[PDB]
Amino acid sequence: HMPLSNFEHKVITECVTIVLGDAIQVAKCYGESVLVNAANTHLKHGGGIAGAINAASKGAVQKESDEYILAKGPLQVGDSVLLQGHSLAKNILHVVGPDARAKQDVSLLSKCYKAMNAYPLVVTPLVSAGIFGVKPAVSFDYLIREAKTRVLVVVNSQDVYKSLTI
């Protein structure tokens, strides 16, 4: 079974496909992929996809992240950091999308998605599209504008999936 058949998906461009499912699982089918974590300034992976990723890695993502943040200090918004994959992916790219509730610049999503272009295959959720208050459609708009590499954008609500795929 070629990986994406385990999932409902729709190719948008030769670059971007929209997959309905859990991004952790999609990334598990591609060992050469980089998994995008939708993270905060302090890489505190307490919930959302950050907590699911931290939990899949059995706490390891949190401890690596604590060492990095202690050493470098906290990340700005739109910053990204490539860290270990903890066998969930070749690597995890921790991406700090803007927080709309806090009235942060949503065009910083462009900076977040740009970072994904350094990798040949990336599996990502919609950055800032949950508690951070950016509509998934709006997050998807920033992604499709910047994606120059092969990006599997994975949405785990079926409603979001139907909206994105017309």
Of residues 49 and 77, the one with the C-beta less far from ligand ATP: 49
Q: Which residues of 8-17 are buried (b: 16+ CB within 10 A; e: fewer)?
A: ebeebeeebb
Residue 55 is assigned to a ligand binding site: no
Q: How far is residue 33's CA from residue 91's CA, in Å, rounded to a whole number?
A: 7
Residue 37 is assigned to a ligand binding site: no
Task: Return the residues of window 41-60 that contact ligand ATP according to CB under 6 A.
Answer: 48-50, 52
Sheet strands side by side (includes 150-155): 8-11, 16-20, 150-155, 121-124, 34-39, 91-96, 80-84
Residue 96 engages ligand ATP in binding (rule: CB under 6 A):
no
Residue 22 engages ligand ATP in binding (rule: CB under 6 A):
yes
Tokens representing 27 are 């990334």
Of residues 77 and 126, the one with the C-beta less far from ligand ATP: 126
Dihedral (Cα; 130, 50, 95, 66), 10-degree rounding:
140
Q: Which segment (4-12, 109-117, 124-132, 140-148) binds ligand ATP by CB under 6 A?
A: 124-132
Residue 24 is assigned to a ligand binding site: no
Under a CB-based contact definition with an 8 Å cutoff, are residues 93 and 81 in contact? yes
**Which residue from 11, 31, 59, 131 is in contact with ligand ATP, where contact means CB under 6 A?**
131
Least Å distance between CB 13 and ligand ATP?
A: 20
Tokens representing 102 are 């806090």
- Interacting residue ranges for ligand ATP, rule: CB under 6 A: 22-24, 38, 48-50, 52, 125-126, 129-132, 136, 154-157
For the annotated binding site for ATP, the residues are: 22-23, 49, 129, 131
